[PDB]
Structures are given as C-alpha cells and as structure tokens.
C-alpha cells in the first residue's frame, strides 16, 4: 500500500433506473452487456485498466502519464455509442443508450485492503470521489465528459472548454467534441 | 442472469475526503482496514455477502428473507464503531470513524455481466441505486441508518421511525437506536 498518482475513470448509463423500470429482463441484459463491451474494449485498447463494475457503472484507472488516453478513451466511447444509436431503429432500446463520463487526477492510496474474510484491491483518495461526482455532474451538463484541471494539464490537441468552478470547490473542463446531440427520460418513456 | 428479490447494503465512512486530506498514509490505511474488518465480519456473521469494495464504500447483499439480519448488521456496526471511539483517546484518528448505512429491497438482475476482456458478477436494478442514495442520505439525517419500506415489511422488534417521503419519490425509515450521538468535519479539522 503506497501513495501513487493516477487518473480515475467513471462512466455509467444515463437514466438507467427508468430503463430498468420499463424494459424486460432480456433487453436490460443486452443493453448493459453492450455498454460493458464497448467501455472495457476501448479502455483496454488505450492501456487503461478496468477495475470493477458497480451496477451499470464502470470504474477504470490510467497512469499519471496517460491523460491523453483517458480523453481519447472517453471520446471513442461517446462516438461508438452515437454510431450505435444511428444504426438501430428508433423503436430499438439501444437507441436510448447514452453515457456520462467523469475523469479526475490526483494522489490515491493503492493497495490490497480489507480483512481476512474479504481482501480486495482498492483505490483511496480524493481523485476517486471527484471522478464519480464529475460523472454524475454530466447529467445536468450539455457534455457527456467532464474532467479536472489535472487531466487537462494535452493542451495542443483539444479545444478545452472551461465550465467554471463547481462542487471544497474544483474547476471542471470538457471538450467541444463531447457535446450531447432531462429530455432523455422523456425520450425513453415516449418510445417505450 | 435472472430477476431475483434481494436486500442491498451500502455503507461508507463519513467525511472520508477530509480524512484523506489531513491524515498520513499509514493512518488512512489503519482507519480503512478497521472499517472493512468490522463491516465484513458483522455482515458475514448474519449470513450477508460482501460483494465488492469501492474506495471506502462497502456493498453487500442479503436474501429476500433476511431483512431482520440487514437491520441487526447495521446496528451492530454502529454499536461497535461507537465502542471503538470511546476506547480511544480524543487525539486518536479512530475517534472520528463514523458511518452511514443505506438499505433497500426490490427486484434486481443477478448474473455475470461484461465482455470477454472483463466479466464480473453484477446486480442491476433500482434497489442498488436506492440503497446507495439512502446511504448518502444519512449524511443530512440524524440517523446513521436509513432503509425503504421493503426492508421494514420485522415490525414486532424495532420502534420504526418514519422520516417521510424523499427523492420518483420513496419513503424512508430508520430506528431510534440508529441515532447519532456537518459538525463531524469541524470535529475532524479541530482535532487534526
């Protein structure tokens, strides 16, 4: 167990509660397995490491030098999900599969934690909680991706959008390519 | 993968971000391992099953007939943590170890989910998200335990306190023995 610098990845399915309230069991399985397959493949392709699944949430980590990969991974997941919704009919529940991604950067305590009854690899630090809250912050944001200033520290490639300070407080950033093209739940209930 | 009725357990350390901001690495490890050891032992003692660790959060599940155990498990964790803080000096960081527990009941999709690169046992349903939000709901509540009406459905044993409807909306319940004996973060910063 030691203190290491890492980049934390958090992503989940938007309006997943309403999706599990109206879709049958076989369709929820297909939709979640589709989301897990797209996320883990793109994360692993850029050297990322998927740590664990929590319901519909995907947690991954990148090394301190892989800020370029964490952004490219997020953009590739968003683009592949947008191509998925366009290649299916409007009545297909896959047409409602959106995501929200949060990235953070900072020191975290990495090591095996727990007791004799349960030992598990764990990441402890502010960067883990910040990445989860920025991921949930994208639900009220027009961009499916949000990261801190530590992930941005990759300037020559993307047009970084400064969304300002949010809940102490931190600064939130995003990219223009992460723009989303509430009304999701209304789109789900009307279609299904 | 099938639809099963379960009781979901979620618990974390209160003000864990401020604790990781002021305590050294060796002390955070001791505090988290203490919390994991107390939780997993009491959960396993009542037949519960600790599913996974997420930072400082502990996720567990009980069968549909173990609503009596999920409440007793929560009360035993609260009592053992209260006895821990009284058997240590006020300067000991273990004197600041509090918890918040959320319980839920409902149908969840149980089965192995993911892709070929990552397969993991997963629980999908409203009961998983509700238990996590009731656990976070205890931070603004005077009780370290909060559960839905499905967990309460065990009437002859506890004096159930009806806290009313909260965020659709659900009803929240607790017990008088879960009373806590914001000021936590102020207690942490002054002591440390």
Q: Choose among B1, B2, B41: nearest Cβ to A117.
A: B41
- Spatial CB neighbours of A91, under 8 Å, sequence gap ≥ 6: A191
Q: What's the N-to-C CA distance of chain A in angstroms?
A: 48
Q: What interhelical angle do A25-45 and A67-86 show, nearest 10?
A: 140
Which of A4, A26, A55, A136 should be substituted to probe chain B, the one whose Cβ sees the most B Cβ atoms within 10 Å?
Answer: A55
**If you ran DSSP here, which 8-state letter would residue A182 be given?**
-
Element (H, E) at A165: strand A160-166
Residue A98 · residue A14 · CB < 8 Å: yes
Which of B22, B122, B126, B133 should be substituted to probe chain A, the one whose Cβ sees the most A Cβ atoms within 10 Å?
Answer: B122
Closest-CA residue of B relative to A121 is: B53
DSSP bridge pairs for A173:
A147, A162
Give CA–CA dist B3/B49, Å, rounded: 18
SS3 A49: strand
**If you ran DSSP here, which 8-state letter would residue A15 be given?**
T
Give CA–CA dist B121/A46, Å, rounded: 24
Closest-CA residue of A relative to B111 is: A29
Tokens of A118: 């349960």
Instruction: Look at A25 and B109 and tell me if their CB atoms are within 8 Å.
Output: yes
**Beta-carbon pairs below 8 A across chains A and B:** 110
SS3 A51: strand
Question: How far lies A138's CA from each of A19, A75, A113, B172, in Å?
Answer: 18, 14, 30, 27
Tokens of A139: 């639900």
Instruction: Look at B122 and A1 and tell me if their CB atoms are within 8 Å.
Output: no
How far A176 CA lies from chain B's nearest CA (Å)? 30
Alpha-carbon torsion A68, A111, A126, B57, what sign?
positive
Instruction: Look at B1 and A118 and tell me if their CB atoms are within 8 Å.
Output: no
Nominal resolution (angstroms): 2.3
Which of A117, A119, A189 should be substituted to probe chain B, the one whose Cβ sees the most B Cβ atoms within 10 Å?
Answer: A117
Q: What is the DSSP string of chain B?
A: -EEEEEEEEEEEETTHHHHHHHS-HHHHHHHHHHHHHHHHHHHHHTT-EEEEEETTEEEEEEETT-HHHHHHHHHHHHHHHHHHHHSS-TTSGGGG--EEEEEEEEEEEEEEEE-SS-EEEEEESHHHHHHHHHHHHGGGSSBSEEE-HHHH--TTTS-EEEEEEE---EEEEEEGGGB---HHHHHHHHH-
- Please give the angle made by the CA atoms of B83, B19 and A135, to the nearest 5 degrees: 120
Q: How many CB atoms lie within 10 A of CB B6?
A: 22
Give CA–CA dist B93/A32, Å, rounded: 41
> How do the domains of chain A map onto residue ranges?
1-192
Q: Choose among B21, B37, B118: nearest Cβ to A126.
A: B21
Q: How many CB atoms lie within 10 A of CB B36?
A: 23
Phi-psi region of A31 (alpha: psi -120 to 50; beta: other; left: phi over 0): alpha
Judging contacts by C-beta atoms under 8 Å, the chain B residues touching residue A33 are: 113-115
Judging contacts by C-beta atoms under 8 Å, the chain A residues touching residue B123 are: 55
Q: Choose among B55, B56, B122: nearest Cβ to A53.
A: B122
Residue from B13, B179, B188, B187 nearest B100 by CA: B13
Give CA–CA dist A177/B172, Å, rounded: 41
Judging contacts by C-beta atoms under 8 Å, the chain A residues touching residue B25 are: 1-3, 109
Tokens of B2: 């099938």
């Amino acid at each position: 167990p030691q203190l290491v610098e890492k980049i934390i990845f958090f992503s989940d399915i938007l309006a997943f509660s309403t999706l599990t309230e109206k879709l049958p069991v076989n369709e929820v399985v297909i939709l979640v397995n589709r989301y897990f397959s797209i996320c883990t493949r793109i994360i692993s392709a850029y050297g990322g490491e998927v740590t664990k699944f929590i319901g519909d949430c995907v947690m991954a980590s990148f090394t301190k030098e892989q800020g370029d990969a964490a952004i490219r991974t997020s953009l590739d997941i968003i683009s592949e999900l947008k191509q998925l919704r366009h290649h299916v009919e409007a009545t297909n529940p896959l047409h409602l599969l959106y995501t929200g991604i949060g990235l953070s950067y900072g020191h975290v305590i990495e090591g095996n934690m727990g007791s004799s009854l349960k030992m598990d690899h764990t990441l402890l630090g502010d960067a883990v909680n910040v990445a989860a809250r920025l991921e949930a912050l994208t639900r009220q944001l027009p961009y499916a991706l949000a990261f801190t200033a530590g992930v941005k520290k990759c300037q020559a490639q993307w047009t970084f959008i400064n969304l300002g300070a949010h809940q102490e407080a931190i600064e939130v950033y995003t990219v223009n390519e992460a723009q989303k093209y509430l009304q999701i739940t209304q789109l789900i209930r009307q279609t299904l």
